[PDB]
């Protein structure tokens, strides 16, 4: 996909800064459109970063900070938009790069030295910030107001030009001092200043060079289907003001008729349907959260839709960050009451250290692990899952055994979905877990933690991008000094924890939550049938023939026969006589046959058949 998701970790140091580089390389590989923010933080000179060349446009903003490289590979970047801004004030900030006068004799320690944003033409919103970067040249000679949008000139710009080295100029092959950088490939192009009059975008001094009005990033030819990247949208190479209509009206009655020509909205794109972890909308958008009075229903194909509840929509449990908890970081002893029996939590789940040793000042209880038994109906999580603390009593994450899927719409640090660190436990125990909708999985700094490399991560993603992050944990050669691994019966050795209850896919059978070798068909006392590798008893009457069995389905009438008596089709060990009518007849005093037929009574009452040639029917 040419479209991918940016991150949100403004000036925070990374979680695992040794590995933090290769988080990006899996992330921004071959992607052109960013749904988020290009954040380039703490990058040393050894970073081969040439995978960044396929990036055309960021919808959000671009931040580059605290790095140690000489040049950056951001040159096919056409335009930035700035849905979000940095500090509500900036859209392009390059800060604090190089080395801020530490005790380190290096010739080129880093610092971005030229612009080399070669394809950058326009900017819609925001400001430009350049501060505290000694290793920069060529930045002052740049006319920003052309790069600013003409009809959008919130023109705050702070460019600190304190340098620490000598800057010989660019190539004199530029028409003036307008240059990206020192090469003749690196001249600053123009789309507003040489333009004039009613023309806003022109590719030269002629009025014929003036571009189409819907074209943001300039034009090749003067038609709207000729341009480079367009202003409001991009529908199939046509730069319309709107996505086409999703309904056709009477114009008199305005009667609803479904237009099939229309499209949905998604960022800068009009697309037919929404991508994988998104939501189709009645208005025709692809968003993250359904609007009000609107239920994310289980759609027919799984490509979900928000739709109107006729009744009130149910109280669906809000997790972290949504509509009741939009600031609360951790989980307290107070909010945890709300998760009683919840199965599809809307919102995230975070396990901070302070989740478990609660503040008496902000007077919360240190949490009890017995209280964690409330998470056991949980099917699906839209939010993410932050885990940093865990009780030493528990060697596992067995609270989350029942959890199938984590969509991970809101992402941790704008990027992450499963976060595991700082525990020391040995396995997880995530026996239902099968699909991560987006985000990455990070596992680091845990003492005894084996079994992660055994997890078949191929079945758990819906892009060719999202990999696993193992580092800094229990060594694999020490995991066989244990002598334990996935069990015999795990399909291709794929297990969560140790033992028979832990395989991802079993090979033989299912006895509850326990893959077993065989089931009691012909061998043991609680005999159980087979339902496509599922072993269940009968109502306890497959009276085990030496070679066979006596009621197949748990409805007790199928394998062969009875055991003691027959109430046909069913069987008893004693012919019962109940009192609870629901129609006035009881099971009247059924006499057994020789061959087990509990057979009822000839006379109504007073005369015979109380099974012992006696009395017992009243009145």
């Amino acid at each position: 996909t040419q479209v991918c998701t940016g991150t949100d970790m403004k000036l925070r140091l990374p979680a695992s800064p040794e590995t933090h580089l290769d988080m990006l390389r899996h992330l921004y590989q071959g992607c052109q459109v960013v749904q988020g923010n290009l954040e380039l933080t703490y990058l040393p000179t050894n970073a081969s970063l040439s995978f960044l060349q396929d990036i055309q446009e960021v919808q959000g903003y671009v931040l580059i900070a605290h790095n140690q490289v000489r040049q950056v590979p951001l040159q096919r970047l056409r335009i930035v938009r700035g849905t979000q801004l940095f500090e509500d004030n900036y859209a392009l900030a390059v800060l604090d790069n190089g080395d801020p006068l530490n005790n380190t004799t290096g010739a080129s320690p880093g610092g971005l030295r030229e612009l080399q944003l070669r394809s950058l033409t326009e900017i819609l919103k925001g400001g430009v910030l350049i501060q505290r970067n000694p290793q920069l040249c060529y930045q002052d000679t740049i006319l920003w107001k052309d790069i600013f949008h003409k009809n959008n000139q919130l023109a705050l710009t702070l460019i600190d030009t304190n340098r620490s080295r000598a800057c010989h100029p660019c190539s004199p092959m530029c028409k003036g001092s307008r240059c990206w950088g020192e090469s003749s490939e690196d001249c600053q192009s123009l789309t507003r200043t040489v333009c004039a009059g009613g023309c806003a975008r022109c590719k030269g001094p002629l009025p014929t060079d003036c571009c189409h009005e819907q074209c943001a990033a300039g034009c090749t030819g003067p038609k709207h289907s000729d341009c480079l990247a367009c202003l409001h949208f991009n529908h199939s190479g046509i730069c319309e003001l709107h996505c086409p209509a999703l309904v056709t009206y009477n114009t008199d009655t305005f009667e609803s008729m479904p237009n099939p020509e229309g499209r949905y909205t998604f960022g800068a794109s009009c697309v037919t349907a929404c991508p994988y972890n998104y939501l189709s909308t009645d208005v025709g958008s692809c968003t993250l959260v359904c609007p009000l009075h609107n239920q994310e229903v289980t759609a027919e194909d799984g490509t979900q839709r928000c739709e109107k509840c006729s009744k009130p929509c149910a109280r669906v449990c809000y997790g972290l960050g949504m509509e009741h908890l939009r600031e609360v970081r951790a989980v307290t002893s107070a909010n945890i009451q709300e998760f009683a029996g919840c199965k599809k939590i809307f919102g995230s789940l975070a396990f901070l250290p302070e989740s478990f040793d609660g503040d008496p000042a902000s007077n919360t209880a240190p949490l009890q692990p017995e209280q964690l038994q409330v998470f056991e109906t949980l099917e699906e999580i839209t939010g993410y899952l932050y885990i940093s603390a865990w009780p030493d009593s528990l060697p596992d994450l067995s609270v989350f055994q029942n959890l199938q899927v984590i969509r991970g719409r809101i992402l941790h640090n704008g990027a992450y979905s499963l976060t595991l660190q700082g525990l020391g436990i040995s396995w997880l125990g995530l026996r239902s877990l099968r699909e991560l909708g987006s985000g990455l999985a990070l596992i680091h700094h845990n003492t005894h933690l084996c079994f992660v490399h055994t997890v078949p991560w191929d079945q758990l993603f819906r892009n060719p991008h999202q990999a696993l992050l193992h580092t800094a944990n229990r060594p694999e050669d020490e995991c066989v000094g244990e002598g334990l691994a996935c069990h015999q019966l795990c399909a291709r050795g794929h297990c969560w924890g140790p033992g028979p209850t832990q395989c991802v896919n079993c090979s033989q059978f299912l006895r509850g939550q326990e893959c077993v070798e065989e089931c009691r068909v012909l061998q043991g006392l609680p005999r159980e049938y087979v339902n496509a590798r599922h072993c269940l008893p009968c109502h306890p009457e497959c009276q085990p023939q030496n070679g066979s069995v006596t009621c197949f389905g748990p409805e007790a009438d199928q394998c062969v026969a009875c055991a003691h008596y027959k109430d046909p089709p069913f069987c008893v060990a004693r012919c019962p006589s109940g009192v609870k009518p629901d129609l006035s007849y009881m099971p009247i005093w059924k006499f057994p046959d020789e061959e087990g037929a509990c057979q009822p009574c000839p006379i109504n009452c007073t005369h015979s058949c109380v099974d012992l040639d006696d009395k017992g029917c009243p009145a």
């Epitope: 409805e555 046909p568 046959d593 037929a597």
Partner: antibody
Framework: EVQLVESGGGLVQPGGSLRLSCAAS????????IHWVRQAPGKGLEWVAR????????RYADSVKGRFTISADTSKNTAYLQMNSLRAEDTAVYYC?????????????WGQGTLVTVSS | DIQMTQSPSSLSASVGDRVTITCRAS??????VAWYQQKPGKAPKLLIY???FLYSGVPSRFSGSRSGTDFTLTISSLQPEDFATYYC?????????FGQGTKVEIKR
């Protein structure tokens, strides 16, 4: 009185899909087996399927083996019949019934039946 | 599974006459047989439960018996209102089968 309601059936395209209904009266299907019996109009009878709604265990005729799925809502106390993949000779008269009574394995109380003459 | 022969499937007689019905089993089905009645436009309503017991709320002009595999529904007196298609079925094993559908007429 035990009283039931069979509604919704009729002419659909062959291959259609539809949830029918059967509503209780004065009893509960907590301790009752529910059934369906089709009949080609003016022809012989034929049992179809059965449920125990506490556990939902199903039996079927081989002509409707695996295609139909019985279903019930004991919280609504209103048994249903989701029909699936309607066929050439599905044109028959349905009826809902009961097995109220652990000895009473008979169907004398019914509803009314809605004819399901699904065809082209 | 089980065959349930009804010989014949239609017959004619006069009001106030004995009824003799041949509902034939097919297998080692022992007892669990029930008779049924439905008029055109109606529900299949019980005649005999437990293969020998007429159902309550119904007058006792009926009769039940047991012989081998040929178990007989008998009414002492045919009536003009006592007129339908008539049925016999089992509940000995799943599936609960049916007979072919026998019928009693009013002869002229």
């Amino acid at each position: 009185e035990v009283q039931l309601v069979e509604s919704g059936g009729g002419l659909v395209q062959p291959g259609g899909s539809l949830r029918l209904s059967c509503a209780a009266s004065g009893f509960n299907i907590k301790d009752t087996y529910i059934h369906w019996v089709r009949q080609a109009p003016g022809k012989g009878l034929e049992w179809v399927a059965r449920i125990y709604p506490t556990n939902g265990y199903t039996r079927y005729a081989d002509s409707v083996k695996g295609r139909f799925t019985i279903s019930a809502d004991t919280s609504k106390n209103t048994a249903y019949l989701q029909m699936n993949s309607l066929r050439a000779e599905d044109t028959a008269v349905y009826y809902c019934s009961r097995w109220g009574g652990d000895g009473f394995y008979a169907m004398d109380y019914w509803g009314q039946g809605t004819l399901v003459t699904v065809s082209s | 599974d089980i065959q349930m022969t009804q010989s014949p499937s239609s017959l004619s007689a006069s009001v106030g006459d004995r009824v003799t019905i041949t509902c034939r089993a097919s297998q080692d089905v022992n007892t669990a047989v029930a008779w049924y009645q439905q008029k055109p436009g109606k529900a299949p309503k019980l005649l005999i439960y437990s293969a020998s017991f007429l159902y309550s709320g119904v007058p006792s002009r009926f009769s039940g018996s047991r012989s081998g595999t040929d178990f007989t529904l008998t009414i002492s007196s045919l009536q003009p209102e006592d007129f339908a298609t008539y049925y016999c079925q089992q509940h000995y094993t799943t599936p609960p089968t049916f007979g072919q559908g026998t019928k009693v007429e009013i002869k002229r």
